[PDB]
């Protein structure tokens, strides 16, 4: 399968750099160039640069090329972006993504790295269990868990370590008037698998390394 | 320094046909390309070289390109055509170029009734001094939602932080209201209701405090 995966998403000062990576698999890495495309919050999409990947020559959108590098490792089939003097516009979400061989379109996209610029701490998410206290005898329960107090985006959710996924609802955040963000995540069960099995929600905050495994029913 | 310009909209009813048009000057020259972003998802490629579709798009969505217009037709609209769709060229001096997207909303749907959720304030959260009620509405169509929260059946307006509706995968719409209070208010009252209303219907959930 043709994949692109991408490093994860990160917090990074005003005039410091980030350098994103696109590991890419399932076809022969120096058949096609590589492309890196951003897009800021609810805007649309600009184009950064395109790479070969047989002679790391690249052309740039020229309002980068002064402070974009692209780079190939042809020994681990990845694509690298670094981005330098980062400015708060450059809060975007980073796509590389695969140009057509022989062609100009962009055939395949990568899920995307967040990159944050702002001088505002990181904050890991505080996870609390979402139980009703005595809920009317019904086959149908809702257990959930709150991500509460990051910054910045994003967050991802499972439960029961990827295992559950039937049911599961994970809610976009909430973005307080304190610059946190919060989320929750809830899974409708059957009632009877209540006291059988654990349900755990797993939290992953890439900017601030902080990944919280939280226990809602035993 | 080429340009593509896109409208900012189209609104297309379940069933029925809209064309996005892409305008550049000569653009008739140019193959141009389409890309289609759902909500909270990365571009995938629909159409390229002006017309051919890539694998897995079905035939009810057409391009074509001519004079100083291209353009993108999508027939028989299904839930799952709702976002965002850029075109692209390639110039050989401004390189790759993309239009400013226009978003696509498919109308005429059937209305879904919110499915709402309140939970208390956890026991880990009043150990740390804190109190959060969450109310989760999910699985609701159209977008529009209100909510309003009660302590006592008295309306609540301070600490209320509402989320505005965001589809979902099922192309229904999800919100989150939360209401902050001190662990002292929280027990104060005998009870504190969520109440969402939806085209009309009103839904409420209720939490008591001596339940807990």
């Known amino acids: 399968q043709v994949q692109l995966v991408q490093s994860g998403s990160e917090l990074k000062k005003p005039g410091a750099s980030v350098k994103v990576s696109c590991k890419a698999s399932?076809?022969?890495?120096?058949?096609?160039?590589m492309d890196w495309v951003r897009q800021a919050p609810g805007q649309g999409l600009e184009w950064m640069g395109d790479?070969?990947?047989?002679?790391?020559?690249?052309i740039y959108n020229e309002e980068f090329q002064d402070r974009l590098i692209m780079t190939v490792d042809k020994s681990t089939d990845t694509a690298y972006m670094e981005l330098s003097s980062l400015r708060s516009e450059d809060t975007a979400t980073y796509h590389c993504?695969?140009?057509?061989?022989?062609?100009?379109?962009?055939?395949?996209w990568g899920e995307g790295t967040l990159v944050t610029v702002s001088s505002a701490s990181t904050k890991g998410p505080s996870v609390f269990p979402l139980a009703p206290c005595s809920r009317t005898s019904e086959s149908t329960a809702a257990l959930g868990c709150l991500v509460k107090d990051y910054f910045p985006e994003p967050v991802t959710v499972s439960w029961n370590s990827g295992a559950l996924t039937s049911g599961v609802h994970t809610f976009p955040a909430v973005l307080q008037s304190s610059g946190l963000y919060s989320l929750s995540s809830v899974v409708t069960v059957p009632s009877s698998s209540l006291g059988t099995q654990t349900y755990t929600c797993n939290v992953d905050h890439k900017p601030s390394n902080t990944k919280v495994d939280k226990r809602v029913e035993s | 320094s080429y340009v593509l310009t896109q409208p900012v909209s189209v609104s297309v009813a379940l069933g029925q046909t809209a064309t996005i048009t892409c305008e550049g000057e000569?653009?008739?020259?140019?193959?141009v390309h389409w890309y289609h972003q759902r909500p909270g998802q990365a571009p995938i490629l629909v159409m390229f070289?002006?017309?051919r579709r890539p694998s897995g798009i079905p035939e009810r969505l057409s391009g074509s390109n001519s004079g100083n217009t291209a353009s993108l037709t999508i027939s028989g609209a299904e839930a799952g055509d709702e976002g965002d769709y850029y075109c692209?060229?390639?110039?050989?001096?401004?390189?790759?170029?993309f239009g400013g997207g226009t978003k696509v909303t498919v109308v005429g749907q059937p209305k879904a009734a919110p499915s709402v959720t309140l939970f208390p304030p956890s026991s880990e959260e009043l150990q740390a001094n804190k109190a959060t009620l969450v109310c989760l509405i999910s699985d609701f169509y159209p977008g529009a939602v209100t909510v309003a929260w009660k302590a006592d059946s008295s309306p609540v307006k301070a600490g209320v932080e509402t989320t505005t509706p965001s589809k979902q995968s099922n192309n229904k719409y999800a919100a989150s209201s939360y209401l902050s209070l001190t662990p002292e208010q929280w027990k104060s009252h005998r009870s504190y209701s969520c109440q969402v209303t939806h085209e009309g219907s009103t839904v409420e959930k209720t939490v008591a405090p001596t339940e807990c």
């Open positions: 692209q060229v390639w110039d050989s001096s401004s390189y790759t170029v």
């Open positions: 070289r002006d017309a």
């Open positions: 000569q653009i008739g020259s140019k193959e």
């Open positions: 790479i070969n990947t047989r002679s790391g020559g690249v």
């Open positions: 993504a695969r140009r057509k061989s022989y062609g100009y379109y962009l055939d395949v």
């Open positions: 399932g076809y022969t890495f120096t058949q096609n160039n």
